[PDB]
Amino acid sequence: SHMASRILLNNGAKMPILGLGTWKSPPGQVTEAVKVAIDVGYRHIDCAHVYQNENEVGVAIQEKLREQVVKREELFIVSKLWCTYHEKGLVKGACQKTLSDLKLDYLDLYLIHWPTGFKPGKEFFPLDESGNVVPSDTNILDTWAAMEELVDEGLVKAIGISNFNHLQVEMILNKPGLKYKPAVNQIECHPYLTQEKLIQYCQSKGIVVTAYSPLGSPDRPWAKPEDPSLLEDPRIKAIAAKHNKTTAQVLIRFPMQRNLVVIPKSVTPERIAENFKVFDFELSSQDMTTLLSYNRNWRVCGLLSCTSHKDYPFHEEF
Ligand SMILES: NC(=O)c1ccc[n+]([C@@H]2O[C@H](COP(=O)([O-])OP(=O)(O)OC[C@H]3O[C@@H](n4cnc5c(N)ncnc54)[C@H](OP(=O)(O)O)[C@@H]3O)[C@@H](O)[C@H]2O)c1
């Protein structure tokens, strides 16, 4: 379908363009979800410590390795450093906890989950008595240096960023003494948040973009009935019908044809399989431009409790 399965990263490794998301996947369902995904062809799993389900994801990965359904070198496992671990002295331990839970001896890619550092401690969103999230002082260039050390210690093959705006990406690229460029910026992207400016910037610097919430995250916990709904948009349904595919399949193919990686989440076996069957059709340029035209700057993930943080990413235009 004029579509290779992997994209070359600036660390020299190849990354599967379609992965399985795991945010909100219940711990009692995610082991089967990941097993099914690997069985039906997925080779990339997107994880995070803050999702609280890495142990269960890891059970699935380990079983499929033990069963010899896949070899470790064929898998591309991604996780993310949570905001309460931006300190120099906490990054390695946070990575190692993720490795121990996923039952891996390296990650293919480790991302700074958000540019905002928070006070370390047990709470993922530490609050002051008035409800503000308590920041860390550690600046993100120092967090990046700590990520670089993980490459040099063999814990991770690639490092990257997530939810960074273009000025924050530029800060990393302009870092004095930069040793490794970010390989990936993982950002929200779908027809209602098309991200042209940030995607162009990242791609022009050789940074691969991964699109999260490609279906508009209908299970996001703050969903309101009045919100827009990609899967129910009749205009997108019409493009899907024309191609004899589902709306979800169109929504997944869309970022693929922008040279993005995409990570739809499901715990439903039939949908996991459906979502992978996107290498057998092509959207036209006109389809692509039409889908881009639906942009409304609508965000699933605004980190809305953190808008006063000095490194909050979404005040900038892009
Ligand atoms: N870096 C970040 O800050 C960040 C933020 C958000 C997301 N992410 C990553 O991106 C992944 C994907 O984003 P997301 O989880 O927000 O949402 P999403 O992938 O846009 O949507 C997931 C929702 O769509 C449903 N669904 C999946 N396939 C479907 C299909 N074929 N037909 C109908 N409904 C379908 C799922 O239901 P069922 O599961 O019940 O089947 C679930 O409710 C996350 O899981 C996470 O790995 C990263």
Coordinates of N, CA, C and O in Angstrom, one line a residue, residues 11-106:
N11 N 19.0 7.7 15.6 CA 20.0 6.9 16.3 C 20.4 5.6 15.4 O 21.2 4.8 15.9
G12 N 19.9 5.5 14.2 CA 20.2 4.4 13.3 C 19.3 3.2 13.4 O 19.5 2.2 12.7
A13 N 18.4 3.2 14.4 CA 17.5 2.1 14.6 C 16.1 2.4 13.9 O 15.8 3.5 13.6
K14 N 15.4 1.3 13.6 CA 14.1 1.4 12.9 C 13.0 1.2 13.9 O 13.1 0.3 14.8
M15 N 12.0 2.0 13.8 CA 10.8 2.0 14.7 C 9.5 1.7 13.9 O 9.2 2.3 12.9
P16 N 8.8 0.7 14.4 CA 7.5 0.4 13.7 C 6.5 1.5 13.8 O 6.3 2.1 14.8
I17 N 5.9 1.9 12.6 CA 5.1 3.0 12.5 C 3.7 2.8 13.2 O 3.0 3.8 13.4
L18 N 3.4 1.6 13.5 CA 2.1 1.3 14.2 C 2.4 0.6 15.5 O 3.1 -0.4 15.5
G19 N 2.0 1.2 16.6 CA 2.2 0.6 17.9 C 0.8 0.6 18.7 O -0.2 1.2 18.3
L20 N 0.9 -0.2 19.8 CA -0.3 -0.3 20.7 C -0.2 0.6 21.9 O 0.8 0.5 22.6
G21 N -1.1 1.5 22.1 CA -1.2 2.3 23.3 C -1.7 1.6 24.5 O -2.5 0.6 24.3
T22 N -1.3 2.0 25.7 CA -1.7 1.3 26.9 C -2.2 2.3 28.0 O -2.5 1.8 29.1
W23 N -2.4 3.6 27.7 CA -2.9 4.5 28.7 C -4.4 4.1 28.9 O -5.2 4.0 28.0
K24 N -4.8 3.9 30.2 CA -6.2 3.5 30.6 C -6.5 2.1 30.4 O -7.6 1.6 30.7
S25 N -5.6 1.3 29.8 CA -5.8 -0.2 29.7 C -5.8 -0.8 31.0 O -4.8 -0.7 31.7
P26 N -7.0 -1.4 31.5 CA -7.0 -1.9 32.8 C -6.0 -2.9 33.1 O -5.7 -3.8 32.2
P27 N -5.4 -3.0 34.3 CA -4.4 -4.0 34.6 C -4.9 -5.4 34.3 O -4.1 -6.3 34.0
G28 N -6.2 -5.7 34.6 CA -6.7 -7.0 34.4 C -7.1 -7.4 32.9 O -7.5 -8.5 32.6
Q29 N -6.9 -6.4 32.0 CA -7.1 -6.6 30.6 C -5.9 -6.4 29.7 O -5.9 -6.9 28.6
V30 N -4.9 -5.7 30.2 CA -3.8 -5.3 29.3 C -2.9 -6.4 29.0 O -2.2 -6.4 27.9
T31 N -2.7 -7.4 29.9 CA -1.9 -8.5 29.5 C -2.4 -9.2 28.3 O -1.7 -9.5 27.3
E32 N -3.7 -9.6 28.3 CA -4.3 -10.2 27.1 C -4.2 -9.2 25.9 O -4.0 -9.7 24.8
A33 N -4.4 -7.9 26.1 CA -4.4 -7.0 25.0 C -3.1 -7.0 24.3 O -3.0 -7.1 23.0
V34 N -2.0 -7.0 25.1 CA -0.6 -7.0 24.5 C -0.3 -8.4 23.8 O 0.3 -8.4 22.8
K35 N -0.8 -9.5 24.5 CA -0.6 -10.8 23.9 C -1.3 -10.9 22.5 O -0.7 -11.3 21.5
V36 N -2.5 -10.4 22.5 CA -3.3 -10.4 21.2 C -2.6 -9.5 20.2 O -2.4 -9.9 19.0
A37 N -2.2 -8.3 20.6 CA -1.5 -7.4 19.7 C -0.3 -8.1 19.1 O -0.1 -8.0 17.8
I38 N 0.6 -8.7 19.9 CA 1.8 -9.3 19.3 C 1.4 -10.5 18.4 O 1.9 -10.7 17.3
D39 N 0.4 -11.3 18.8 CA -0.1 -12.4 18.0 C -0.6 -11.9 16.6 O -0.4 -12.6 15.6
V40 N -1.2 -10.7 16.5 CA -1.8 -10.2 15.2 C -0.8 -9.3 14.5 O -1.2 -8.7 13.5
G41 N 0.4 -9.1 15.0 CA 1.4 -8.4 14.2 C 2.0 -7.2 14.8 O 3.0 -6.7 14.3
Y42 N 1.5 -6.6 15.9 CA 2.1 -5.5 16.5 C 3.5 -5.8 17.0 O 3.7 -6.9 17.6
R43 N 4.5 -4.9 16.8 CA 5.8 -5.0 17.3 C 6.3 -3.8 18.1 O 7.5 -3.7 18.3
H44 N 5.4 -2.9 18.4 CA 5.7 -1.7 19.1 C 4.6 -1.5 20.2 O 3.4 -1.6 19.8
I45 N 5.0 -1.3 21.4 CA 4.1 -1.1 22.5 C 4.5 0.2 23.2 O 5.7 0.4 23.5
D46 N 3.5 1.1 23.4 CA 3.8 2.4 24.0 C 3.3 2.3 25.5 O 2.1 2.0 25.7
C47 N 4.2 2.6 26.4 CA 4.0 2.4 27.8 C 4.4 3.7 28.6 O 5.0 4.6 28.1
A48 N 4.0 3.7 29.9 CA 4.5 4.7 30.8 C 4.4 4.3 32.2 O 3.4 3.7 32.6
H49 N 5.3 4.7 33.1 CA 5.2 4.4 34.5 C 3.9 5.0 35.1 O 3.2 4.4 35.9
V50 N 3.5 6.2 34.7 CA 2.3 6.8 35.2 C 1.0 6.1 34.9 O 0.0 6.3 35.5
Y51 N 1.1 5.2 33.9 CA -0.1 4.4 33.5 C -0.4 3.3 34.6 O -1.6 2.8 34.6
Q52 N 0.5 3.0 35.4 CA 0.3 2.0 36.5 C 0.0 0.6 36.1 O -0.5 -0.2 36.8
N53 N 0.4 0.3 34.9 CA 0.1 -1.1 34.3 C 1.3 -1.7 33.6 O 1.2 -2.7 32.9
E54 N 2.6 -1.2 33.9 CA 3.7 -1.7 33.2 C 4.0 -3.2 33.6 O 4.5 -3.9 32.8
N55 N 3.8 -3.5 34.9 CA 4.0 -4.9 35.3 C 3.2 -5.9 34.4 O 3.7 -6.9 33.9
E56 N 1.9 -5.5 34.2 CA 1.0 -6.4 33.4 C 1.4 -6.4 31.9 O 1.3 -7.4 31.2
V57 N 1.8 -5.2 31.4 CA 2.3 -5.2 30.0 C 3.5 -6.1 29.9 O 3.6 -6.9 29.0
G58 N 4.4 -6.0 30.9 CA 5.6 -6.9 30.9 C 5.3 -8.3 30.9 O 6.0 -9.1 30.3
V59 N 4.3 -8.8 31.6 CA 3.9 -10.2 31.7 C 3.6 -10.7 30.2 O 4.1 -11.8 29.8
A60 N 2.9 -9.9 29.5 CA 2.6 -10.3 28.1 C 3.8 -10.3 27.2 O 4.0 -11.3 26.4
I61 N 4.7 -9.3 27.3 CA 5.9 -9.3 26.5 C 6.7 -10.5 26.8 O 7.2 -11.2 25.9
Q62 N 6.9 -10.8 28.1 CA 7.8 -11.9 28.5 C 7.2 -13.2 28.0 O 8.0 -14.1 27.6
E63 N 5.9 -13.4 28.1 CA 5.3 -14.6 27.6 C 5.5 -14.8 26.1 O 5.9 -15.9 25.7
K64 N 5.3 -13.8 25.3 CA 5.5 -13.9 23.9 C 6.9 -14.1 23.5 O 7.2 -14.8 22.5
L65 N 7.9 -13.5 24.2 CA 9.3 -13.9 24.1 C 9.6 -15.3 24.4 O 10.2 -16.1 23.7
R66 N 9.0 -15.8 25.6 CA 9.2 -17.2 26.0 C 8.6 -18.2 25.0 O 9.2 -19.2 24.7
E67 N 7.4 -17.9 24.4 CA 6.8 -18.7 23.4 C 7.5 -18.6 22.1 O 7.1 -19.4 21.2
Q68 N 8.4 -17.7 21.9 CA 9.1 -17.5 20.6 C 8.1 -17.1 19.5 O 8.3 -17.4 18.4
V69 N 7.1 -16.3 19.9 CA 6.3 -15.7 18.9 C 7.1 -14.6 18.2 O 6.9 -14.3 17.0
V70 N 7.9 -13.9 19.0 CA 8.8 -12.8 18.5 C 10.1 -13.0 19.2 O 10.2 -13.6 20.3
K71 N 11.2 -12.3 18.6 CA 12.5 -12.2 19.3 C 12.5 -10.7 19.8 O 11.9 -9.8 19.3
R72 N 13.3 -10.6 20.9 CA 13.4 -9.2 21.5 C 13.8 -8.2 20.5 O 13.3 -7.0 20.5
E73 N 14.8 -8.5 19.6 CA 15.2 -7.5 18.6 C 14.1 -7.1 17.7 O 14.3 -6.0 17.0
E74 N 13.1 -7.8 17.5 CA 11.9 -7.5 16.7 C 10.9 -6.6 17.4 O 10.0 -6.1 16.7
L75 N 11.0 -6.5 18.7 CA 10.1 -5.6 19.4 C 10.7 -4.2 19.6 O 11.9 -4.1 19.7
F76 N 9.8 -3.3 19.7 CA 10.2 -1.9 19.9 C 9.3 -1.4 21.1 O 8.1 -1.1 21.0
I77 N 9.9 -1.3 22.3 CA 9.2 -1.0 23.5 C 9.6 0.4 24.0 O 10.8 0.7 24.1
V78 N 8.6 1.2 24.2 CA 8.7 2.6 24.5 C 8.1 2.8 25.9 O 7.1 2.4 26.2
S79 N 8.9 3.6 26.8 CA 8.3 4.1 28.0 C 8.7 5.5 28.2 O 9.3 6.2 27.3
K80 N 8.3 6.1 29.3 CA 8.3 7.5 29.6 C 8.6 7.8 31.0 O 8.1 7.2 31.9
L81 N 9.5 8.8 31.2 CA 9.9 9.3 32.5 C 8.9 10.3 33.1 O 8.6 11.3 32.4
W82 N 8.3 9.9 34.2 CA 7.2 10.8 34.7 C 7.8 12.1 35.3 O 9.0 12.2 35.7
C83 N 7.0 13.1 35.5 CA 7.3 14.4 35.9 C 8.0 14.6 37.2 O 8.7 15.5 37.5
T84 N 7.7 13.6 38.2 CA 8.3 13.7 39.5 C 9.6 13.0 39.6 O 10.2 12.9 40.7
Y85 N 10.2 12.7 38.4 CA 11.5 12.1 38.3 C 12.5 12.9 37.5 O 13.5 12.4 37.0
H86 N 12.3 14.2 37.3 CA 13.2 15.0 36.4 C 14.5 15.2 37.1 O 15.5 15.6 36.3
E87 N 14.7 15.0 38.4 CA 16.0 15.2 39.0 C 17.1 14.3 38.5 O 16.8 13.1 38.2
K88 N 18.3 14.8 38.4 CA 19.5 14.0 38.0 C 19.6 12.7 38.7 O 19.9 11.6 38.1
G89 N 19.5 12.7 40.0 CA 19.6 11.5 40.8 C 18.5 10.5 40.8 O 18.6 9.5 41.5
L90 N 17.4 10.9 40.2 CA 16.2 10.0 40.1 C 16.0 9.3 38.8 O 15.2 8.4 38.7
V91 N 16.6 9.9 37.7 CA 16.3 9.4 36.3 C 16.6 7.9 36.2 O 15.8 7.1 35.6
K92 N 17.8 7.5 36.6 CA 18.2 6.1 36.4 C 17.3 5.2 37.1 O 16.9 4.1 36.5
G93 N 17.0 5.5 38.4 CA 16.1 4.6 39.1 C 14.7 4.5 38.5 O 14.1 3.4 38.5
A94 N 14.2 5.6 38.0 CA 12.9 5.6 37.3 C 12.9 4.7 36.1 O 12.0 3.9 35.9
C95 N 14.0 4.8 35.3 CA 14.1 4.0 34.1 C 14.2 2.5 34.6 O 13.6 1.6 34.0
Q96 N 15.0 2.2 35.6 CA 15.2 0.9 36.0 C 13.9 0.3 36.6 O 13.7 -0.9 36.4
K97 N 13.1 1.0 37.3 CA 11.8 0.5 37.7 C 10.9 0.1 36.5 O 10.3 -1.0 36.5
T98 N 10.9 1.0 35.5 CA 10.2 0.6 34.3 C 10.8 -0.7 33.6 O 10.0 -1.5 33.2
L99 N 12.1 -0.8 33.6 CA 12.7 -2.0 33.0 C 12.3 -3.2 33.8 O 12.0 -4.3 33.2
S100 N 12.4 -3.1 35.1 CA 12.1 -4.2 36.0 C 10.6 -4.6 35.9 O 10.3 -5.8 35.8
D101 N 9.7 -3.7 35.8 CA 8.3 -4.0 35.6 C 8.0 -4.6 34.2 O 7.2 -5.5 34.1
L102 N 8.6 -4.0 33.1 CA 8.4 -4.5 31.8 C 9.2 -5.8 31.5 O 9.0 -6.5 30.5
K103 N 10.1 -6.2 32.5 CA 10.9 -7.3 32.5 C 11.9 -7.4 31.4 O 12.2 -8.5 30.8
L104 N 12.4 -6.2 31.0 CA 13.3 -6.0 29.9 C 14.7 -5.6 30.5 O 14.9 -5.1 31.6
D105 N 15.7 -5.8 29.7 CA 17.1 -5.3 30.0 C 17.5 -4.1 29.2 O 18.6 -3.5 29.3
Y106 N 16.6 -3.6 28.3 CA 16.7 -2.3 27.7 C 15.4 -1.9 27.2 O 14.5 -2.7 26.9

